[PDB]
Amino acid sequence: SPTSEIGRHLAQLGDSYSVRFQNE
Amino acid sequence: MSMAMSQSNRELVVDFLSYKLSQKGYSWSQFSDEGTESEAVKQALREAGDEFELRYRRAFSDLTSQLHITPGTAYQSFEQVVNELFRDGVNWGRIVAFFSFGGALCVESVDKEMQVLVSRIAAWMATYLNDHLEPWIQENGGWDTFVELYGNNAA
């Protein structure tokens, strides 16, 4: 289903973001 | 502090969406209406959204296309995506992703002449932020912490 999968990749990206661009 | 914070969260959402709309040549006005100053929260969120959309553009563009939006199905699609986004918990990166997703929906709605959605997407984002994220935000230092951890002094 599109929405559940779209939400999971968004979560994946957000988690990558949270590690990448942490500055402290 | 709930709705001391609830008016503020609304202003963050409107400001982010207005900024993403303005990047394409659209305008928010056409479709309706702690130590770090709110202008810095707004800017850090604008910044983070830009870096998120840049670095994950393809993955993010592909994902925004897979949900076929209509004014009569958009609300359910938005809430389902966000439920899955935060299923395993909340961190600042998923909140950035949450804002970028909403902004992408606003812009696509205008592109496809579904502009009635623009102001509703803002309402849904603010309601979900106020009802389901603000507890985590409060527990985790408020928006001060977001700026301190993800702020960048190059705009």
From Swiss-Prot, chain B:
A motif (BH3) lies at residues 41-55. Proteolytically cleaved by caspases during apoptosis. The cleaved protein, lacking the BH4 motif, has pro-apoptotic activity. This phosphorylation is partial in normal mitotic cells, but complete in G2-arrested cells upon DNA-damage, thus promoting subsequent apoptosis probably by triggering caspases-mediated proteolysis. Phosphorylated by PLK3, leading to regulate the G2 checkpoint and progression to cytokinesis during mitosis. SUPFAM superfamilies: Bcl-2 inhibitors of programmed cell death. GO terms for cellular component: Bcl-2 family protein complex; centrosome; cytoplasm; cytosol; endoplasmic reticulum; mitochondrial inner membrane; mitochondrial matrix; mitochondrial outer membrane. A motif (BH1) lies at residues 84-103. One of its GO terms (molecular function) is BH3 domain binding. Pfam families: Bcl-2, BH4. Bcl-X(S) is expressed at high levels in cells that undergo a high rate of turnover, such as developing lymphocytes. In contrast, Bcl-X(L) is found in tissues containing long-lived postmitotic cells, such as adult brain. A motif (BH4) lies at residues 8-28. SMART domains: BCL, BH4. It comes from the Eukaryota. Homodimer. Interacts with BCL2L11. Interacts with BAD. Interacts with PGAM5. Interacts with HEBP2. Interacts with p53/TP53 and BBC3; interaction with BBC3 disrupts the interaction with p53/TP53. Interacts with ATP5F1A and ATP5F1B; the interactions mediate the association of isoform Bcl-X(L) with the mitochondrial membrane ATP synthase F(1)F(0) ATP synthase. Interacts with VDAC1. Interacts with BCL2L11 (via BH3). Interacts with RNF183. Interacts with GIMAP3/IAN4 and GIMAP5/IAN5. This is Bcl-2-like protein 1. It comes from Homo sapiens (Human).
